[PDB]
Amino acid sequence: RECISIHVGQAGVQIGNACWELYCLEHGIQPDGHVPRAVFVDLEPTVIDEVRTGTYRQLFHPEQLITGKEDAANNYARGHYTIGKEIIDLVLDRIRKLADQCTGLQGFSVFHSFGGGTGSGFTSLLMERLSVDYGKKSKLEFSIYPAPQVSTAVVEPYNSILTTHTTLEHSDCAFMVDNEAIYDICRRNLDIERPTYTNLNRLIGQIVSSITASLRFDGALNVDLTEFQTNLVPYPRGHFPLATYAPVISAEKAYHEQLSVAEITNACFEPANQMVKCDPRHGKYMACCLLYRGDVVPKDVNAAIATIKTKRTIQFVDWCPTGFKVGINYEPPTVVPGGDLAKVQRAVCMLSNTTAIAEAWARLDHKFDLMYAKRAFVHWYVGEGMEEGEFSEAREDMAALEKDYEEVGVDS
């Protein structure tokens, strides 16, 4: 029935801020209503304390939020292993503790950013543990993955590889959304030169709102979380879809906004609005879930997909004869009242595992090696210890990923 989310990392937290914030709007549960789904975890106290001080203060229980006075470090090593371990006990107990109460949990949709020490590192084990324990459960992870050029952290590629490597067996399905990639949506589509981190999170807010919130909300098509992986993922890794939102259209400036199903759906496919750098150069599309909310007529949808299928620039992979998963939800996307959002009557979100990510991983992968050969920052990692060890061995594993991704497509 229900799923519980966990937000980790500062970034995962700040999304954590957004995801809930959007939620409250939708549900119409004001400041002080019911009680939250999900907990937040950060090694760095200040940020979580932002939650503590900041908006939706009461809404969470202090039980829910997990913190440490202790140092985050921008590295995989402490966060995973060293500093790492101490927190998890509280963390896991929380998740089980929460899990226990609910009836029939589908699974947890964990948020993290690749992305940092607590985002990497700490989380990786957390999911790691989950697989054994929950096991039966479906474990999706929502990740934010390093902007190609942009990445803030110096260390960063070290973190991601390890994170992706470690988690990979564990997660049923992981969504990846690109930070700078989204930015282009901001820049071109809404045209904000300004946009803050809050903005992006809002954007993710909307997209996520479909996946968890709306879907679970009863609707014509009704898609399960479990379906998500089942339909989405061809193969035992771990596979990471991208998440797309058609309606991104700017609030103030332009009002085409009645853009019926055909156009809106059409909007997503173009490389522009991915919220991922991926911009499918080559990329094949294994499979897609399209989840729509708003006023949709399934004929409108059904026709719409059919044309899309044909245009054949799209070029799906052979092995899937067809892989379109329509999901229709009654209730329209809910736009946060003021700030940026268009507030379209109908919206499309569409996720898919595409061959294209293989491009991203390669680039991501490439970053890793450059530092690694010099070996760089690693002394920090080894200190947290960590060993030569994980890095290279992990390195190969994700190297497997690149082959895996490549092999999936490009051959018939």
Partner: protein
């Protein structure tokens, strides 16, 4: 996380007065003082610097180390002055001694344990310990010498916790001390092993920046000290403040430092406009970027042109777009591909903090790592041998009970330390 300040040496102390001068204001503390604090927020993080004895009284947690009674006394007798807990002062009437040798071995040694006593007491105080800060000059007997020694014990006692250093590296053009090669070389020798993060400031560089960058005709020391205090504040206190993407010291350590040397960085403040006319209000973003990155307005002597960057960290504090900040940097990166250094894919570590330096709108501290500094090091050492070979000053040191080998060793270590830097450079 909590941080404890160290003031060793007169320079040492002089800066310390200024550092707290700003910091106290930054936190909103009056001399004996309390949190007048314009905003609420400043109150919360304060603990890093201070302890809560009175409730009114938040007294900065840091130690003053100085053989020279005069220097310390002036500081006490000076404005902020009274604020310090008297315990904090660790003093020794004994002759200050220009000698690094005097400070380290002979004179310094006795005091040090006494010094260490308090450091622990502050250390022990409460919550978790981020690490210690240091100011001093390579400098002189108290500035280096003892101070350089002091870190040593610190390194031993709590290895995990981090030390950042500020050293006034000897000003190239005319050295304010005759001895300058001797004290400086040995002292840096200690840091390079000891302190995981070091920051260098140079006086003339300050003059240059102050004098050009600010209209300021008459730089006073209180000025240079003041500007210097500006960077470190961005570094330490700012990140303690909230930020959309906020690093902390360890982030600064981790991201910034490729290799174990701990390396040295050069602070650079984002806003540096004259009083006055210069107030453009072109803070927006890019103007900030231009300012820090530019060759001048680099606190340390060396010029990045020379000049490649192992790492850059900008801790902007102010409310700015993530989009612009992150995006802008890239163009900087692409624009200056030659110097940046290829291997490390994203040179700049970006920190954003919500709240600006209490007066001003938007500023970033710029910190971090470049090959160029190596040029600086050659200077000290180069002086070192010319002095050394002739051994002009030396007798003071050795009479003090110092070793011949010791001199040689220190130079070579830093000397090759220079050599290390080049390797990355190419």
């Amino acid at each position: 996380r909590e941080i404890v300040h160290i003031q060793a040496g007169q320079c040492g102390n002089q800066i310390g007065a200024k550092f707290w001068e700003v910091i106290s204001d930054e936190h909103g503390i009056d001399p004996t003082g309390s949190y007048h604090g314009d905003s609420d927020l400043q109150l919360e993080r304060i603990n890093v610097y201070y302890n809560e004895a009175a409730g009114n009284k938040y007294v900065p947690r840091a130690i003053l180390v100085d053989l020279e009674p005069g220097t310390m006394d002036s500081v006490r007798s000076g404005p902020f002055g009274q604020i310090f807990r008297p315990d904090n002062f660790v003093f020794g009437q004994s002759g200050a001694g220009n000698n690094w040798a005097k400070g380290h071995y002979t004179e310094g040694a006795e005091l040090v344990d006494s010094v260490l006593d308090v450091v622990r007491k502050e250390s022990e105080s409460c919550d978790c310990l981020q690490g210690f800060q240091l100011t001093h000059s390579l400098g002189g007997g108290t500035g280096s010498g003892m101070g350089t020694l002091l870190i040593s014990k610190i390194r031993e006692e709590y290895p995990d916790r981090i030390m950042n250093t500020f050293s006034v590296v000897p000003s190239p053009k005319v050295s304010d001390t005759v001895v300058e090669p001797y004290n400086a070389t040995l002292s840096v020798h200690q840091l390079v092993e000891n302190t995981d993060e070091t920051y260098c400031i140079d006086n003339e560089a300050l003059y240059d920046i102050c004098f050009r960058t600010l209209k300021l005709t008459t730089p006073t020391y209180g000025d240079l000290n003041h500007l210097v205090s500006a960077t470190m504040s961005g570094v330490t206190t700012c990140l303690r403040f909230p930020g959309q993407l906020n690093a902390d010291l360890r982030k600064l350590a981790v991201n910034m430092v490729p290799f174990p040397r701990l390396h040295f960085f050069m602070p650079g403040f984002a806003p540096l406009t004259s009083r006055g006319s210069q107030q453009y209000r072109a803070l927006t973003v890019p103007e900030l970027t231009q300012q820090m990155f530019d060759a001048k307005n680099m606190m340390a002597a060396c010029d990045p042109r020379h000049g490649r960057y192992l790492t850059v960290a900008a801790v902007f504090r102010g409310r700015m777009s993530m989009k612009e900040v992150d995006e802008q940097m890239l163009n900087v990166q692409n624009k200056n591909s030659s110097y940046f250094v290829e291997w490390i894919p994203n040179n700049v570590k970006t920190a954003v903090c919500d709240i600006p330096p209490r007066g001003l709108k938007m500023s970033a501290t710029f910190i971090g790592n470049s090959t160029a500094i190596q040029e600086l090091f050659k200077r000290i050492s180069e002086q070192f041998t010319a002095m050394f070979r002739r051994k002009a000053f030396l007798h003071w040191y050795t009479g003090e009970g110092m070793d011949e080998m010791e001199f040689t060793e220190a130079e070579s270590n830093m000397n090759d330390l220079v050599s290390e830097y080049q390797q990355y450079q190419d």
